[PDB]
Design a protein around this nucleic acid. Structure first.
Length: 143
RNA sequence: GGGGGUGAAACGGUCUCGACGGGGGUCGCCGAGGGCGUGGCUGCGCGCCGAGGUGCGGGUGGCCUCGUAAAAACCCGCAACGGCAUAACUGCCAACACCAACUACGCUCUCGCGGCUUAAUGACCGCGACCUCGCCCGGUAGCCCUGCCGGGGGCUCACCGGAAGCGGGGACACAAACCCGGCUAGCCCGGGGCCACGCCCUCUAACCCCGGGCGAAGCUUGAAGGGGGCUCGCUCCUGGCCGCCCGUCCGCGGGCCAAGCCAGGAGGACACGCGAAACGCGGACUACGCGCGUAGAGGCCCGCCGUAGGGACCUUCGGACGGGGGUUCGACUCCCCCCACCUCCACCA
């Protein structure tokens, strides 16, 4: 369906700030999300950058047999002017509240976008002893 | 085996709200103290020799060219530089140290009886020692209080000793081999007077200090002065020397002074100064030597905004429907047409 979502932050983690970005991609992914595939892969980013390069994300290839696609979890440009794209960047390197795809989707005109945020929900902070039990019961179920 | 469903949530209005990459602006980064001279000064300039570099340069012999000409080298560096990146740790496998129960501890440092400190048990303390040390009194040797008034402070186990008082043991680690407290160093022999409006003989000082004497030998008082003994002119300052010629070199000329002498005067010292004159009109600047013309890395102005060049950035404009060509804003669709993988079709050798 042309609006779906990525639940890897909605029972697992969830957001502290939300943003969205258009993502150019080579047409070979379009029918698969428009029909009904979704993703849950761990996106990351690396970002001493002018824009904000996302690392990893499946829209899925469209398929019958082999088709003409190339792996979707490659780098993609992210639409938004540099200054407020630096607002999405503003906390991305804090290693604890971290970049997540929230909802892959298309706009009304059929071009692809991703709702994005920065999130946590397992533990108050990692690498502590105390709150790891809440990261394996609770933060794989609730939020 | 081929033809075609189809790889899009819109017949076209399909301008992902917003990326990039060319613009519109910039103009700071950006081969640069935002400049450069195709130009000028001082009676027409300027020297008496000297410049240059390999890719980018530190260094280095004046290699060498060689004056109508400021024209062609090199050892070594730059080469060297050990650059990773989120949101879920609790798993695999590992460990920790002194004493008097007893042999010195209260026992220094060779012996002998009691005590009783864990039984320190004849070494401590109350005491019995040859031989040495100490207190306390006496002597050769040591005495640099060398005045009197109260007391000649007064003697050292050094060299010898327990006698007039006495004690430990092989070390009880000394103070006197020079001392306290009062009168001007008294009592008294004796040296001597200098420096600050120059000093002292006279003076604020019985003239005096006090180095010093009797158990053994020689420098001052002064805060102020008329005259004298000392090194003095009381003490200093009035005119000849000297310092200087004004863009680089000078034609034509030549006086005075900050200040000591030789030598006269003036105030109370050497506490701080009484008016004749050092430059001025010009003679050149290779146009009077070797030379020529912008000499060849002096010193300041005058004239061209030196280009906005040399660069890279924002927003903003141009966008990914499997690719690939039409094209009124895109266009597997409206149309030509390439590949996946399926769906429909005329066949045995």
């Amino acid at each position: 369906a042309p609006v779906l979502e990525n639940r890897r932050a909605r029972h697992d983690y969830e957001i502290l700030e939300t943003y969205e970005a258009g993502i150019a991609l080579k047409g070979t992914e379009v029918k698969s999300l428009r029909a009904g595939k979704v993703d849950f892969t761990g996106s990351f980013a690396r970002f001493e950058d002018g824009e904000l390069y996302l690392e990893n994300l499946y829209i899925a290839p469209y398929e019958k047999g082999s088709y003409a696609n190339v792996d979707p979890r490659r780098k993609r440009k992210l639409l938004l002017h540099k200054h407020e794209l630096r607002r999405l960047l503003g906390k991305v390197e804090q290693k604890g509240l971290t970049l997540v795809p929230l909802k892959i989707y298309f706009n009304e005109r059929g071009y692809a976008k991703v709702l994005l945020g920065l999130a946590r929900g397992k533990k108050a902070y990692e690498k502590r002893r105390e709150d790891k039990k809440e990261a394996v019961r609770r933060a794989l179920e609730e939020l």
